[PDB]
Design a protein around this ligand. Structure first.
Ligand SMILES: [Mg+2]
Ligand SMILES: [Zn+2]
Ligand SMILES: [Zn+2]
Lengths: 87, 1270
DNA sequence: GGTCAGAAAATCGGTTGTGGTCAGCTGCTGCCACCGGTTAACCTCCAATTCTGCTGCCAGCCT
DNA sequence: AGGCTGGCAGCAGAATAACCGGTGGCAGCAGCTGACCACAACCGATTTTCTGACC
């Protein structure tokens, strides 16, 4: 059955979600909410840039600048090693 | 009932599905015979695989693509139609097919007895002709319109026949005028006298055939009127022309039809209550064939009457469709497809149904439409059961397709291939080798298998020790086998048992749980003392290793199933971890004594003292390490740490020699001292020679007096010393150690003369062709025995071959006789003895003809041993299925019943001789009443275990009978009690209150197959056991007496005839056709005329049938008879089974009674009901008005008593799956899941062992003082 | 030998500006895949054994 | 005069070759977009905090 649950990818996916929740929780609240709403980690629905800007009360260029800075912060190795081994 | 299948079960009720249940299960109607589009591979709309009906293929992803998230859940895509949910609902959703004409179920029409035929009272050959479109059937008829139109229509019929007669007399007058014209034109022509009259004779012959044709049409009209005047429902009409004539002349007054629609109309016009009243009136009044027919109809009519079922579910309007994940279409590697043969059957049904809808809505003649309906009926029949009526539907290559019923039956069905035996994870195989340095609780496990078995544990541990960062890198490290993983693997393998199992698993000691350790290699190193339990050689045999995961499973494998907790065999109680053959040769050499060896004690004096004594076994061992003392020479040591035997102890120290300290002198060898240092400290000094029976007695005494850890450690020490002294024993085989006897030529000549004289007398003609065969066979049997005796008295006592045989290690003496001496006689493909014989031994070398003769018997023995294991497996299967519901439920039934036990019958001169079969009849069962001796006190009180000191005390006090307590008289309702079972043979204590004693009994009986040889027309091997447990009538059926009296022997032609004259002046009883070969029975004297016989004396040699001895001498004497006849098959081959393992099977045959008089309560005569249900009904019914139903005991075999059970789920998985399911459906039977095989199927805890409520609800908490002190 | 306006830093954030950029249809247009109908010399009936229970059948006392 | 009882006999079942018309799908692609990144600059306070001179 070449399309079954491989029983180690499921537990690896659960540990990946746990580690991603940890690394996202070690940030600022506004940046973490922006990243979650941008990549759809809340409820599986990705949100638009103007939608995040509307619900957080700032402009879209401010939102995308905060997103770029937060993506740099996550790309930094100090936060990035424990997720670098997963991929 | 709920259908979510969460584990809250109480019942599992099976019924008969109606059409309004089928179109309430279904999720939509499949109406095209399409499966998958050929180019894009997506499931077609309204086909057999349609996503709108059976759910979507992709998880939370609809078809057209409009909704694709978990956010949309349970929504219906308004363009395409598929709802959005998981893709595992394609194994849980069914569809249905709407048939354009009704179709009968094949199960309720074809399988004998035909339930439709019994319900409608139609013969099967007159029912197949209806439902397969060959004969019409009158569904209904009018009565009063028929009554007055009888007069009017017979007036019209007489008028029509009168007009026919008017045309007939027109024919008469026309032929008369034609003959008168022939008279006018032939009365004046001059010709011959007959030629002028042969034309008139031809005209009269034409008149004769005209009136013959008139008779033919008048008989046709008479037949039409007769079959109208005798018209009734359920009456077949063949001759479509005749039915057509009845239809167009008499279109009123009746309705007729043809097929499953007519069957449905007859089922609708049917009154079950009035039919049942008529049937019960017949069974109350009439007799014979009509009464038997009414009973067999009343079975299914009462089944349809008592419940809320209706008979209308036997015809169908909507076939259901199995979900598309159970008949998958799977694409292989490279575009090859694979379907599951059900799509062809469903496609044929859907094609023929669509074509029938087209023909009906078009308007077609009856021949075409009836052929289409017959084709649709045959398609649905081939779907439900292929190859039941006619030819099986074949695929490509001419193999029959696999229909729905073929998924369920046989060894390849669901019930036997996937529900009872499954493949498992965490398992592996290898090939076993011998591990003689291991302890008894250890096994060697190769590291490459142990890594793959313990991979998740080692992944967790090497993540936690920071050798890796996560599970993915840890798995990569394990699969690349980097060298940290062995240091982790040792620490995760410490103290974690595994189960080792070797197929076949004949008895319960074939699965045992060792504690593993790592071994550099690829072979599972096994201990050499568990090979007898596993039945394992090392010729390449393979063993399977499982692995317990949960805490309960590890506790079970550590406590219940550990290797050093199963020393004794559960069948007889003999030890199975006893040393065998190699340690036996070692210990026999160590403890034997040679007279006149080196350093022997000799009391010769006058000049010097004895010079044989020693001051300690340390000094003796030093002298034996020098070249002075042999191990097997008689000395006088001075022991200080070995407990003396009882006589020397009572002589020297009297009572309390505290054997750590005291000193005493023993005149033994040194080998016996070194043997007794292995036994425990309190065990007395043995001082014997260790034959294998002596070692078995020592280990049995140890297991009954000491703890099991002491027995296990002692058994390991015996193994070590046995191997070490087996090496130094000088046991080798050479060609000079096989000595031939020196008188074999003289013995063979002396018997050759007698054989030559017998053959010369046959050539003279004084004896026929068979008497010389018997004489030659007897002569050569005597010659074989004489050669064996000469060999036995010629061989020295210290030969290697005779030491191996005499120490009980291996072999018997007949193998030594054929090795040196004489092979003897040999068999035939028929089985008789070829009277040649084989006069050469395998040391001298057989010749060409003797070798070719010997090959017959050798190959027949090999083929018989191939067959006998399958036969024993089948017998064990049936015994397990009968006795699966005998588990221990209480501690005391508290009855006062019990059987009697023979216990060392009296001698004629006057003394007590011990009965030989006392270790399998009287040991290890509780006393029922007290033992009182010849107006005396109690010797053994009631309730004792009756072991060896109790038996010795009883035989010393001089009593012969005891009333012992047995499971045939256990008075609990469900399962035996525990004091009635006695001690468990495998532990030595009383049996526990969850034990599965029925399965232990069945495996203990069925395991000594493949050592029950038949012979060399009474059966005497394995088929003697099968025809006892099945309770068949035997082959050599010897009759028994029916009343005490005098035998009046009569001798007819070539055989006998016996009529017993009763003493009480009763009716004479006659047995007539008792054949020639049955010789008369001999007791004490041959049965002569005028002899005296008892009520149950067997009259001839052979085998009494067990039904007859039950009918004469009550239910007790058939329990004596069945146990005695089974045990004489096992005792002939030296196999010990305790009798409490046969009484568990025997008590499960006599559970039921047969009804002779119904009385007033719902019990049809000839039926078999349980006795506990019978007596509970009689107490309820004869209260407030006495109408007791009368019942007789019955004895039924182990195949009827396991199909007539109370659960339809345990019965269907045994045997006859189609027949068991097809009448559990009619009765609307409910299963309660109380069994031990129903719980295995549905996957919950069995109700025996640690799965009962006494043990499963234990509350464990720390105590008060240890909670405080931490 | 000290107080007040201006200049000069990131900093958080709004504007804004256009410069592509990608998709979202949208015709639409050709085409291609698929379903349905039609063909008028004549020639008109298929390719092993073992056991248990059930039913059909024929003589034969009984009325 | 037949009938319904009796074995007796025989059998099912289980285990071990093209045209024409039409119609809807479909893929390929210029061609409106129109929302959207997206750099990239440019300012709007903002706060600090020197910088510069003032008397
Ligand atoms: Mg072997
Ligand atoms: Zn959809
Ligand atoms: Zn009991």
């Amino acid at each position: 059955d070449s399309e079954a649950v491989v029983a180690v990818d499921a537990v690896s996916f659960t540990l990946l979600q746990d580690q991603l929740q940890s690394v996202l929780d070690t940030l600022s609240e506004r940046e973490a909410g922006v990243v979650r709403l941008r990549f759809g980690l809340t409820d599986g629905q990705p949100r638009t840039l103007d939608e995040i800007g509307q619900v957080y009360g700032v402009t879209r260029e401010r939102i995308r600048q905060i997103e770029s800075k937060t993506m740099s912060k996550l790309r930094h190795p100090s936060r990035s090693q424990v997720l670098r081994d997963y991929l | 009932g709920a259908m979510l299948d969460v584990n809250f079960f109480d019942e599992l009720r099976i019924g008969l599905a109606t059409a309004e249940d089928i179109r309430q299960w279904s999720y939509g109607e499949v109406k095209k015979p399409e499966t998958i589009n050929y180019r894009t591979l997506k499931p077609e709309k309204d086909g057999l695989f349609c996503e709108k009906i059976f759910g979507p293929t992709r998880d939370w992803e609809c078809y057209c693509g409009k909704y694709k998230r978990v956010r949309f859940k349970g929504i219906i895509c308004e363009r395409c139609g598929v709802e959005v949910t998981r893709a595992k609902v394609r194994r849980e959703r069914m569809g249905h097919i709407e048939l354009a004409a009704p179709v009968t179920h094949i199960w309720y029409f074809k399988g004998v007895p035909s339930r439709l035929g019994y319900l409608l009272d139609l013969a099967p050959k007159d029912l197949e002709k209806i439902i397969y479109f060959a004969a019409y059937v009158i569904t209904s008829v009018d009565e009063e319109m028929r009554h007055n139109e009888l007069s009017t229509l017979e007036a019209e019929m007489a008028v029509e026949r009168k007009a026919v007669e008017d045309q007939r007399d027109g024919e008469l007058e026309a032929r008369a005028q034609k003959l008168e014209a022939d008279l006018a034109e032939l009365e004046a022509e001059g010709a011959k006298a007959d030629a002028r009259r042969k034309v008139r004779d031809g005209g009269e012959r034409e008149m004769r055939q005209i009136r013959d044709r008139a008779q033919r049409e008048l008989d046709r009209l008479e037949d039409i009127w007769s079959t109208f005047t005798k018209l009734a429902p359920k009456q077949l009409i063949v001759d479509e022309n005749l039915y057509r004539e009845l239809v167009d002349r008499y279109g009123e007054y009746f309705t007729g039809a043809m097929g499953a629609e007519s069957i449905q109309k007859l089922i609708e016009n049917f009154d079950i209550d009035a039919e049942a009243e008529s049937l019960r009136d017949v069974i109350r009044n009439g007799k014979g064939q009509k009464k038997l027919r009414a009973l067999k109809r009343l079975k299914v009519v009462a089944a349809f009457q008592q419940s809320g079922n209706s008979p209308m579910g036997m015809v169908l309007d909507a076939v259901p469709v199995i979900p598309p994940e159970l008949r998958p279409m799977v694409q292989l590697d490279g575009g090859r497809f694979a379907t599951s043969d059900l799509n062809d059957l469903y496609r044929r049904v859907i094609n023929r149904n669509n074509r029938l809808k087209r023909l009906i809505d078009l308007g077609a003649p009856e021949i075409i439409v009836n052929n289409e309906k017959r084709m649709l009926q045959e398609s649905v029949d081939a779907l439900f059961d292929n190859g039941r009526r006619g030819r099986p539907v074949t695929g490509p290559g001419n193999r029959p397709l696999k229909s729905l019923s073929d998924l369920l039956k046989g060894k390849q069905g669901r019930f036997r291939q996937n529900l009872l035996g499954k493949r498992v994870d965490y398992s592996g195989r290898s090939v076993i080798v011998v591990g003689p340095q291991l302890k008894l609780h250890q096994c060697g496990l190769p590291k490459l298998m142990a890594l793959e078995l313990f991979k998740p544990f080692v992944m967790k541990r090497l993540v936690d020790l920071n050798h890796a960062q996560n599970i993915k890198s840890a798995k990569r490290m394990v699969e690349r086998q980097r060298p940290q993983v062995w240091d982790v693997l040792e620490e995760v393998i410490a103290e974690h048992p595994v189960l080792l199992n070797r197929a076949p698993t004949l008895h319960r000691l074939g699965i045992q749980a060792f504690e593993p350790m790592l071994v550099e290699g690829k072979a599972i190193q096994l201990h050499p003392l568990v090979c007898e339990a596993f039945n394992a050689d090392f010729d390449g045999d393979q063993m399977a290793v499982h692995l317990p995961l949960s805490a309960e499973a590890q506790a079970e494998a550590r406590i219940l199933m550990l290797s050093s907790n199963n020393i004794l065999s559960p069948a007889s109680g003999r030890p199975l971890a006893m040393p065998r053959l190699d340690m036996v040769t070692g210990l026999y050499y160590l403890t034997t004594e040679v007279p006149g060896d080196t350093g022997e004690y000799q009391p010769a004096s006058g000049d010097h003292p004895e010079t044989g004594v020693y001051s300690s076994p340390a000094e003796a061992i030093m002298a034996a390490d020098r070249g002075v003392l042999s191990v097997r020479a008689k000395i006088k040591v001075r022991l200080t740490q070995l407990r003396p035997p009882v006589e020397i102890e009572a002589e020297l120290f009297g009572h309390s020699g505290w054997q750590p300290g005291d000193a005493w002198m023993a005149e033994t060898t040194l080998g016996r001292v070194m043997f007794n240092e292995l036994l425990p400290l309190g065990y007395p000094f043995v001082n014997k020679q260790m034959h294998k029976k002596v070692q078995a007695a020592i280990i049995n005494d140890l297991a009954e007096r000491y703890p099991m850890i002491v027995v296990a450690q002692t058994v390991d020490k015996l193994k070590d010393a046995g191997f070490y002294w087996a090496t130094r024993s000088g046991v080798t085989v050479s060609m000079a150690d096989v000595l031939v006897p020196p008188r074999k030529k003289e013995i063979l000549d002396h018997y050759e003369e007698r054989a030559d004289k017998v053959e010369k007398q046959f050539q003279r003609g004084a004896l026929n062709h068979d008497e010389r065969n018997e004489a030659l066979v007897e002569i050569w049997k005597e010659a074989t025995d004489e050669v064996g005796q000469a060999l036995r008295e010629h061989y020295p006592d210290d030969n290697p071959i005779i030491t191996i045989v005499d120490s009980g290690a291996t072999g018997n003496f007949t193998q030594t006789r054929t090795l040196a001496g004489m092979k003897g006689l040999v068999t035939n493909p028929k089985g008789e003895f070829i009277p040649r014989p084989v006069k050469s031994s395998f040391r001298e070398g057989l010749t060409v003809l003797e070798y070719f003769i010997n090959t017959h018997g050798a190959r027949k023995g090999l083929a018989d041993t191939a067959l006998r294991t399958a036969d024993s497996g089948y017998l064990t299967r049936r015994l397990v299925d009968v006795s699966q519901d005998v588990i221990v439920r209480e501690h005391d039934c508290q009855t006062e019943r019990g059987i009697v036990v023979e216990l060392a019958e009296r001698a004629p001169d006057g003394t007590l001789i011990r009965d030989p079969y006392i270790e399998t009849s009287a040991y290890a069962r509780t006393l029922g009443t007290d033992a009182v001796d010849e107006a005396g006190n109690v010797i053994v009180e009631r309730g004792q275990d009756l072991g060896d000191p109790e038996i010795d005390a009883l035989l010393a006090a001089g009593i012969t009978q005891v009333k012992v307590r047995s499971v045939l008289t256990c008075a609990t309702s469900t399962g035996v009690c525990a004091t009635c079972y006695g001690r468990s043979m495998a532990t030595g204590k009383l049996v526990d209150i969850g034990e599965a004693v029925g399965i232990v009994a069945a495996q203990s009986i069925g395991e000594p197959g493949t050592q029950l040889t038949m012979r060399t027309d009474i059966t005497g091997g394995l088929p003697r056991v099968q025809e006892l447990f099945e309770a068949r009538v035997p082959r050599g059926k010897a009759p028994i007496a029916d009343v005490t009296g005098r035998v009046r022997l009569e001798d007819g032609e070539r055989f006998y005839k016996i009529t017993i004259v009763p003493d009480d002046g009763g009716e004479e009883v006659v047995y007539d056709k008792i054949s020639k070969r049955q010789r008369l029975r001999v007791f004490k004297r041959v049965l002569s005329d005028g002899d005296h016989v008892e009520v149950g004396q067997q009259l001839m040699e052979g085998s009494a049938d067990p039904h007859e001895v039950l009918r004469v001498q009550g239910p007790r004497e058939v329990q004596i008879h069945l146990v005695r006849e089974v045990q004489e098959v096992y005792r002939a081959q030296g196999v010990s089974i305790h009798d409490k393992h046969i009484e568990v099977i025997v008590r499960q045959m006599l559970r039921r009674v047969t009804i002779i008089d119904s009385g007033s309560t719902e019990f049809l005569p000839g039926s078999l009901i349980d006795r506990a249900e019978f007596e509970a009904e009689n107490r309820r019914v004869v209260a407030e008005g006495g109408e007791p139903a009368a019942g007789r005991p019955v004895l039924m075999g182990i195949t009827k008593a396991s199909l007539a059970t109370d659960s339809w789920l345990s019965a269907a998985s045994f045997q006859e799956t189609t027949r068991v399911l097809t009448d559990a459906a009619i009765n609307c039977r409910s299963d309660k899941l109380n069994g031990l095989k129903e719980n295995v199927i549905i996957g919950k805890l069995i109700p025996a062992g640690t799965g009962i409520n006494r043990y499963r609800n234990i509350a464990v908490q720390p105590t008060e003082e240890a909670r405080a002190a931490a």
